[PDB]
C-alpha cells in the first residue's frame, strides 16, 4: 500500500521534534544533522512487510492555533506528545491537544507519547522540579489518562537511550491499520 499520515502534536520543548528527526535518521540526539525544513519520513518493518510513515510536525504555540488544524484532514493516526518531566505539558494534553484533534477528527486514533523518560530517573531534575512542588509523571498516572481519554494506548520513550523508541512508532503504524 501507501504512506501513513501521522500528525504529531504537543508542546514545544517536550523535545517532540528532537525525537522525530533522531528516529528517522538513525542518529542520537547529539549527532543528527540539523535542518530548516519540517516533517520526516521513515520506513519501519512490521511482520516482514515494510510500511512508510509520514511524520507531520506541528508547532505547539497558541500563535498557530488558527493554521495548524489544516494538516489534520486525511490524518491516519495522531501522536499526542508530552515530556514526563514537564507537567505543564501533560496538562496541555487533557485540556488543549486531545480536545483539538478529537474536535476535527473524532474517528481518528491517537496515542499518548511520553518523552524524555531518561530525565525521570535522573537525580538532578527530580528534586529540581520538586523544588517547585512537582514530581515527574509516573507511567501509572499517564496510562489512566489515556484510558480516560480513549487513546489507543500510552507509550513512552527516550530519544537518547533509544528505549521504547521503536515501540512508539510500531504502535502508531499498527493503530493506523485499525
Amino acid at each position: 500500500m501507501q504512506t501513513i499520515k501521522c500528525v504529531v502534536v504537543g508542546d514545544g520543548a517536550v523535545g517532540k521534534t528532537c525525537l522525530l528527526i533522531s528516529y528517522t535518521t538513525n542518529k542520537f540526539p547529539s549527532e543528527y544533522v540539523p535542518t530548516v525544513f519540517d516533517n520526516y519520513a521513515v520506513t519501519v518493518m512490521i511482520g516482514g512487510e515494510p510500511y512508510t510513515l509520514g511524520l507531520f510536525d506541528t508547532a505547539g504555540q497558541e500563535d498557530y492555533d488558527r493554521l495548524r488544524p489544516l494538516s489534520y484532514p486525511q490524518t491516519d493516526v495522531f501522536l499526542v506528545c508530552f515530556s514526563v518531566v514537564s507537567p505543564s505539558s501533560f496538562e496541555n494534553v487533557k485540556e488543549k491537544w486531545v480536545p483539538e484533534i478529537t474536535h476535527h477528527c473524532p474517528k481518528t486514533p491517537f496515542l499518548l507519547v511520553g518523552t524524555q523518560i531518561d530525565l525521570r530517573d535522573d537525580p538532578s531534575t527530580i528534586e529540581k522540579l520538586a523544588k517547585n512542588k512537582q514530581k515527574p509523571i509516573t507511567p501509572e498516572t499517564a496510562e489512566k489518562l489515556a484510558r480516560d481519554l480513549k487513546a489507543v494506548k500510552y507509550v513512552e520513550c527516550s530519544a537518547l537511550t533509544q528505549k521504547g523508541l521503536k515501540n512508539v512508532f510500531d504502535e502508531a503504524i499498527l493503530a493506523a491499520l485499525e
Partner: protein
C-alpha cells in the same frame, strides 16, 4: 536505498574486549534495521557478560579520543552509515540492474561548531563528512568487516546549507513525478518546504548567505550555487503545488489555499536574493 541493506560502524574501546579493543568494524544488518535495534543488542550482549553497569555506549560520532575514556569501562561507539560511491561508481549503479557488488566505502556525517557544540545557528553549523574504507568488501563471507582507512571532509556552513536545499529540492522532485502519486507523502514534503511552523524555514537560508555578494571569489563559487539551488527549489515547489491541486478533494481545499499562499509569500521575499 536498502536494496543494499543497513550498515553501522562499530568501535570497540576497552581492555575488557580482549582482541576487539581498538578494532572498528562495519556491521551489515538486514534492511531497515534501526539504531535502537543494534545498540540494544550490543549493549545487551556485553551486559550479560561484564555486568550491566560497565557496558557504556558512546552516543556520539566524533572520533574517539582514547584519553577521555575511563579505562575501567567497556565502550562501544555505534554510528549509522551509508555506502559511499564515486560519481563514476554511482552512475553504473543506475543503468545495470545488479548494484550490490563492491561495497567498501561507507559515509557518515557529524555536525559541529567551532564552538565545540554539535549544533549551532544557520551560520555557525559545520559538518564533517567522514569516509570509512573497509579491508574487504560487501557482500562478504562474514557480516562485519573492519575499517582500514578513513577520510574526513569539512563543509563550510554554506556548503551545509546547499546540501540541505539539494536533498529537499529532490525530495519534492521525486514526490511530484511519481506513479501512482502519493498525496500524503507529497503534502508532507510540500508543507514542510513552503509552510514550515517549527524549524527555520528556507527563507532564512537565503537571508543568511545570499544577502551579500562575497568578494573572495573562492567563496563566490559557493554563493552562486546556493543562489541557483534556490532557483531549482522554487521551481520544484510550484510543480509540487500544481500537482497537489490535482490530487486533493474538498476537505483539503483550505489546506492547499494556505500552501499556495505560503509559497507566493516566500517567492516574493526570495526574489531579491535570488537575482
Amino acid at each position: 536505498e536498502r536494496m543494499f541493506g543497513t550498515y553501522f560502524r562499530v568501535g570497540f574501546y576497552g581492555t575488557k574486549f580482549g582482541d576487539l579493543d581498538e578494532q572498528e568494524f562495519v556491521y551489515k544488518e538486514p534492511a531497515y534495521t534501526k539504531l535502537a535495534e543494534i545498540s540494544h543488542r550490543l549493549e545487551g550482549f556485553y551486559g550479560e557478560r561484564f555486568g550491566e553497569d560497565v557496558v557504556e555506549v558512546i552516543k556520539d560520532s566524533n572520533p574517539v579520543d582514547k584519553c577521555k575514556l575511563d579505562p575501567n569501562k567497556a565502550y562501544i561507539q555505534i554510528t549509522y552509515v551509508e555506502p559511499y560511491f564515486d560519481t563514476y561508481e554511482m552512475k553504473d549503479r543506475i543503468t545495470y540492474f545488479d548494484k550490490n557488488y563492491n561495497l567498501r566505502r561507507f559515509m557518515y556525517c557529524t555536525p559541529f561548531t567551532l564552538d565545540g557544540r554539535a549544533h549551532g545557528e544557520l551560520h555557525e553549523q559545520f559538518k564533517r563528512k567522514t569516509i570509512l574504507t573497509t579491508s574487504h568488501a560487501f557482500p562478504y563471507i562474514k557480516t562485519r568487516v573492519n575499517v582500514t582507512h578513513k577520510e574526513e571532509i569539512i563543509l563550510t556552513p554554506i556548503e551545509v546549507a546547499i546540501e540541505d536545499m539539494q536533498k529537499k529540492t529532490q525530495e519534492l522532485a521525486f514526490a511530484t513525478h511519481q506513479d501512482p502519486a502519493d498525496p500524503k507523502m507529497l503534502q508532507m514534503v510540500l508543507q514542510g518546504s513552503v509552510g514550515t511552523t517549527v524549524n527555520q524555514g528556507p527563507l532564512e537560508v537565503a537571508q543568511v548567505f545570499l544577502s551579500e555578494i562575497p568578494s573572495d571569489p573562492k567563496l563566490f563559487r559557493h554563493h552562486n550555487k546556493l543562489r541557483l539551488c534556490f532557483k531549482d527549489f522554487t521551481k520544484r515547489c510550484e510543480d509540487a503545488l500544481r500537482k497537489n491541486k490535482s490530487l486533493i478533494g474538498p476537505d483539503q481545499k483550505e489546506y492547499q489555499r494556505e500552501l499556495e499562499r505560503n509559497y507566493h509569500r516566500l517567492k516574493e521575499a526570495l526574489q531579491p536574493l535570488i537575482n
